[PDB]
Point group: D3
């Protein structure tokens, strides 16, 4: 929780950010969202890969043809505003575009417009406080992720999350911290809400987008950092068994950051601790906020 | 629109039926809903297959493990209440169970409870005023319906509708009234929001639930009425070409009722008008509210 | 070979029935055809299920949207004409509608019309003289039949036959008489150019159309005859192994008529001879031309 | 149209290039063909990648086991002959090998031989005169391309085109210039008769042959030219959504040459005009016939 | 354990029934087996559906082309002998045909013969003592059963069980008594080593063999018993969610007999105890050994 | 055959290495094995990639959760011992870990242990004496290899071989030396018991592990050797037709070593003899045992 929320152009007090119960998105999952993080750094509060997330918000809405009034720059300025306004140095930002109080027909009437919301608030490690250091225990779920030409997995839309709910809850019900989903073909897709990486003989592996895996921005950052460290990266389809044969395995995401996976299905991964390559990558990633890692791509956007 | 909405046990003015913008269902599609119809009949206002719809509401919530405080009888009494309170003789009722203002984690915290809403209001023919008589022009969509073990198609959940949105909007964008989706295997599934039936040589055909088709209550009623009329019904997988070789084809649903399909992909179906078997079924269905058709199953629930 | 061929409305001498080498169908497989048989019977020459084949010719062209000038009755009269004209008592008739000398673009220009041809000539048993009595040796091919929503298997079109060529030639190259194809899922579809039936514990089994099997008219006749004989018929998906466990197995088609399969992949079927149920069915089928079997459906069309 | 056509070794007047209506290829799609282009250049008339096309003609025939009497050099000499004989400086050449007047059995009798035809004539831009400059509007088809082990997509055979007909006609029926087909898995295959390329962040992307995409010779030329220009090329499986997120997208083929795609499914691609990378490639391609681009591979075959 | 084992025609003492460690079956899973039960009844010791099991033994070996020296009658006689010789009144019999000490090449040399073994011994309820009365808790496995045309699921061969090991161990590792596997399409196949049945609205449902389910002999008996009791049986494909919506669910097998399933994935089935229809079937089944159920089919084979 | 076999830590005479007929592995395919080769070289008897094979033995058992008492070093020491003890200078070693005489339940009781066996003996070329020089004739099988998430293809387990038996026996039954299997998608997987390679335009191609191909150690060696020779290697999915268009094709495996394939399905590959690239690779491979090829990786383990 925080003080204000940007709602359609104006800062509104948290308690007043309400919407009608007949809002389209509540009944039909018609919304698109993003997960962005603001980190306190050596240059003060900074939003990580800000433009890239806002660009993806526009891309997700474009696929579903949701009209967006605000431009990427407007959304970026609004985001910074929310952080200053709430006096946050570090936080989790949540942009949400949704179809509001329009008719009850599945297809909204021509000429309608969407409601936009940007909320910021402090949020710790998604998979746990000690998760980044010690790693987590994952389980391969019995539920598969969406098939290729059904519900576009490249779009970060609300309705998609019924799948993540099923995958993740099943893992947690059995004592695990997160669940790993396979696609309809039986290959590794990704975790319930985070991308999956494997390390084998010093080489980094990740499933392509065609494995029903969302084009993670953290995923993209890791691939670029790895190339700077001189680590070979291979984007290819991975079998289920590969999880038991890999030297290391970890998950990535905005909320999950970079979490090591110490075991899968009760089978220990390597030494059962955070691996050496995962460590190098974590150090290089968090080094961006200390100044140890040079921001060569302009991933740090100053809030001021 | 109407005057009141049942919200968590009490009648609230329509305009005051608001919910926080950080409600789980707005971000993750975590909601379950129903479509029920109240018809003005020879016995006064009557809710069609009321218990069955409320039973399915509980079933959809059960699959996702959403806790429901209200029993089927409570929900039924609340439904009748909304209709009387709003002075409606005929209307479309919309029960909605959703995960409210709880955390932002995909998996709701233990001990949470859902919010329930029941709204009633007048609503005409989903596919058009003259649709029931003249029929509509459908198009086979380029988007497929959800694969079998991904997002359960037997549950009527909010997030599911991103698919119906894609299928339906594509058809309407090209001049058609509705779109027909095929499953991932290339077989007929159903319309964007209505079951599909075909008539060939006096025999009724419908895809099974395993074709990613939701277990329609109108679909079930039609199969039962058809058997009363002495019409053979075959529940089997159907190829795409069957739509072009069928003597008749129609759609079923609570909102769509029984709508004839006069053409598919520009190819005329039979005579290009409502067929004889579809006619028989329409008369038998609507006859329930006139008294011509005996309600042998107890499908009519008096509102009083 | 015979004397005349019906070509676009007029009887032309066989040798003169030529068409330009730039005819669309030669380059793009754009043609639809039928296989019909005329049998010498107790009522004289009679065409078997004449209207049904002509109706299917129209259906196949309809799916591909090929314009057909002739009506079903015109085509039927033309067919009878060809048989009388050539003095045939028994023969194989071959109706062929194809896209002729039009442009070279894949999609023919609007307003074009198709060329129609009807040729009749004597033709023995497709799988061999002794095949109907002793049976044949079949082999399951390594090539699969067309997937569901790619090239419609319900249409009897020319281009489809590249598949039948592959399936059938492979079997014959290895010493077998015919090849049996599986669909993309690994279930039994049908032979290269004939439907497949299995007999197990007195029950008849056949794959549905959804197994990429063409809706055979001989197949349909057998199903109806079987029901008259009090034989249970089950139209369901069949596994590959079922061919080794079945008591009997046979193929059906216009050209192949009813051919028993004595072995599959070197594994003998039952006694390695024509089975009892297959025999009953053959007797009932050929009995239609002797008068022993009453033509209750009007399958025999007199040529006069 | 032109004056002569090479038919089985000798130049025949166009109007006399006839074949019997009972030719195997008319009924069973048993033919293999090529699309070659002759360009007027700085070195006079020149056939683009002549040997490669004739080599593929032999390869397609080899897969189906069609006997070819003519060697690659004979076919090349005959091709040049047709161009000179018809006084063409620029034209579209169409080599066609087909199973002629042999029996009516699906499998041709042993010892048979095929008929060969080579026709040349002027032909403009396949997708339109202004298509190369302005680009076209494409639509993702509801029909999928052939599954992997059914009808070999690597062979350019006649029967294959029933699929291209379905995909292309559907697009044109809805106001689009061309249709893009997905494979049975739901991934991008290619256009109805042209390969598909996408540009994203300066990188070129194309589906592999395993996506049911024919090994285009223009496709191969573009990949080689791109590498000369220092553009990274990635041959990988592509999701349907990628078409909406791509900076640029274009089609390639002998008849279509290099056509930009300005929109897909009503969604604008980048700027809605020919993109910068597509431009570079177009200039480099057409530069071959001006002398600006050095023919390092020996792609230009002088007709003389 | 017992005193003797029938080994290649002769009664050998249990302790001496050894085979070389280089036996083909030990390295390549090349064996076929059966599970048969001998019950103490009102007619004394009786082997349940003896011939049917031995017939299936021959069928499984036939699929793999393993040569069997003994006829069905000899194997039945041998089975009865082992039961008498070991003084058993009730027991579990295990016939096993395997490729013995032959070469190390995958394909055994021509002219080889198999080794046959028949061991009998007392064996309680597979899923537990109180499992038949109380029911068990099942879990849907993350591992799928063999695809249709890979390793024939209709054959009861040794190598198949690597799959059952994976499915069953996963369930037991999480606190469940048995695991339920889905096929590659995402539909219900069966338990790790027992067929699956569902009861909904008084109707019995079971997946067909094409769902990668072995043709259970107990399954076949239940279907026939149910028809005697006037219970409708439907053999059709079932979705995963159906397990949560079913009134009752139970498993069948020789070793498992008829075990009720009180919960699936933590979701209670009906009342959480053995259901009414399951009970009727159990009573009818076990009634065969008391005389209450008339053996109309000749399922009880006297040992003497 | 040889004199001794290492059995659970002790050298036992060949004839005495027996196990009970009720051993779990005999009935359920519950075993894991390796194929290793000892070559007579310039440094004396040497085991090729010894550690890698023993490492994979542990990996296969780990996937199935079979407990292994011996460490990789103990197994390597045991392997060398057997070779010395049997006075072998060149041989084929066969390590086999299997579930022994434990209960008859599919899941072995907790606390059980496995039996380990290591047998060594002389063994010639798997596909024939002159196969390495002349090449073999292969056939594409009608049986497909295991689907992705069913029975893990990355594990070299006993039960897997029912598939290899079917694929290989079918080829041999038709006059071929080996069969090539496609996966469930219709793409090339590998031979019945050896990996598959293709050479096209001087480039090496091999299917990835996700094509249901086991991670061959010989396959891995060839890829590394090829990179040393400056030959481009591409690990990608391959279509069936690619076998007919390839310049060269060969198989790899411990027992098969490097065997050229001169024809596939009766279609000659290239020149019909061992190709140039295959030859270079063979010479480089066998050169390791002569000293001509430097062992840069430490692949040769001295027996002493
Ligand atoms: C958002 C998301 C991720 C993480 O992506 P980032 O862009 O790295 O935040 C991973 N998986 C799924 C399913 C997601 O929706
Ligand atoms: C609700 C629904 C239907 C219609 O079902 P009824 O129970 O008859 O209202 C059809 N298809 C989908 C996708 C639906 O959600
Ligand atoms: C025509 C055909 C048949 C036979 O059908 P009939 O209508 O019985 O002549 C069977 N299979 C295929 C592939 C066919 O095209
Ligand atoms: C011929 C063809 C192409 C274009 O290939 P080019 O060799 O470049 O002429 C593309 N797609 C299909 C289906 C084709 O047949
Ligand atoms: C043997 C078996 C069964 C049970 O079959 P019964 O003939 O009833 O003993 C069920 N499932 C599998 C996988 C089996 O092997
Ligand atoms: C063992 C095996 C191979 C060969 O692997 P190598 O490690 O090279 O011996 C190939 N295919 C299969 C199916 C195998 O089991
Ligand atoms: C809520 C998360 C599962 C998804 C967005 C993120 O990674 O922040
Ligand atoms: C909007 C509709 C598709 C909802 C279901 C119904 O009420 O029929
Ligand atoms: C030629 C045949 C394979 C097909 C048509 C028929 O059955 O007559
Ligand atoms: C008509 C075209 C699709 C043929 C291929 C080409 O010439 O490009
Ligand atoms: C272990 C069991 C699954 C074997 C088969 C049976 O007896 O039911
Ligand atoms: C029989 C062989 C396929 C076993 C593995 C090998 O040694 O290559």
């Amino acid at each position: 929780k925080a003080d204000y929320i940007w709602f359609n152009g104006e800062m509104v007090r948290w308690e007043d950010a309400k919407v009608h119960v007949m809002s389209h998105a509540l009944h039909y999952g018609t919304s698109v969202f993003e997960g962005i993080r603001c980190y306190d750094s050596h240059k003060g509060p900074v939003v990580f890969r800000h433009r890239e997330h806002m660009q993806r918000l526009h891309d997700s809405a474009k696929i579903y043809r949701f009209p967006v009034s605000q431009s990427i720059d407007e959304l970026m300025e609004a985001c910074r505003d929310v952080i200053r306004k709430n006096n946050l140095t570090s936080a989790y930002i949540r942009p949400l575009i949704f179809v509001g109080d329009v008719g009850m027909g599945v297809n909204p009437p021509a000429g309608y417009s969407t409601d936009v919301i940007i909320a910021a608030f402090p949020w710790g490690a998604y998979l746990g406080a000690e998760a980044l250091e010690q790693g987590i225990d994952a389980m391969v779920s019995s539920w598969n992720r969406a098939a290729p030409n059904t519900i576009p997995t490249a779009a970060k839309a609300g309705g998609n999350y019924l799948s993540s709910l099923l995958v993740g809850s099943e893992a947690r019900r059995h004592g695990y911290q997160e669940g790993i989903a396979l696609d309809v073909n039986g290959y590794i897709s990704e975790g319930a809400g985070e991308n999956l990486f494997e390390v084998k003989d010093g080489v980094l592996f990740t499933p392509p987008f065609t494995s029903s895996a969302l084009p993670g921005i953290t995923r993209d950052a890791i691939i670029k950092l790895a190339k700077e460290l001189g680590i070979e990266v291979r984007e290819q389809v991975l079998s289920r068994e590969s999880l038991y044969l890999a030297d290391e395995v970890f998950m990535s995401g905005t909320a999950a950051e970079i979490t090591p996976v110490r075991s899968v299905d009760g089978i220990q991964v390597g030494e059962g601790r955070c691996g050496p390559v995962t460590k190098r990558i974590q150090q290089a990633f968090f080094g961006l906020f200390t100044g140890e890692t040079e921001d060569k791509w302009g991933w740090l956007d100053q809030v001021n």
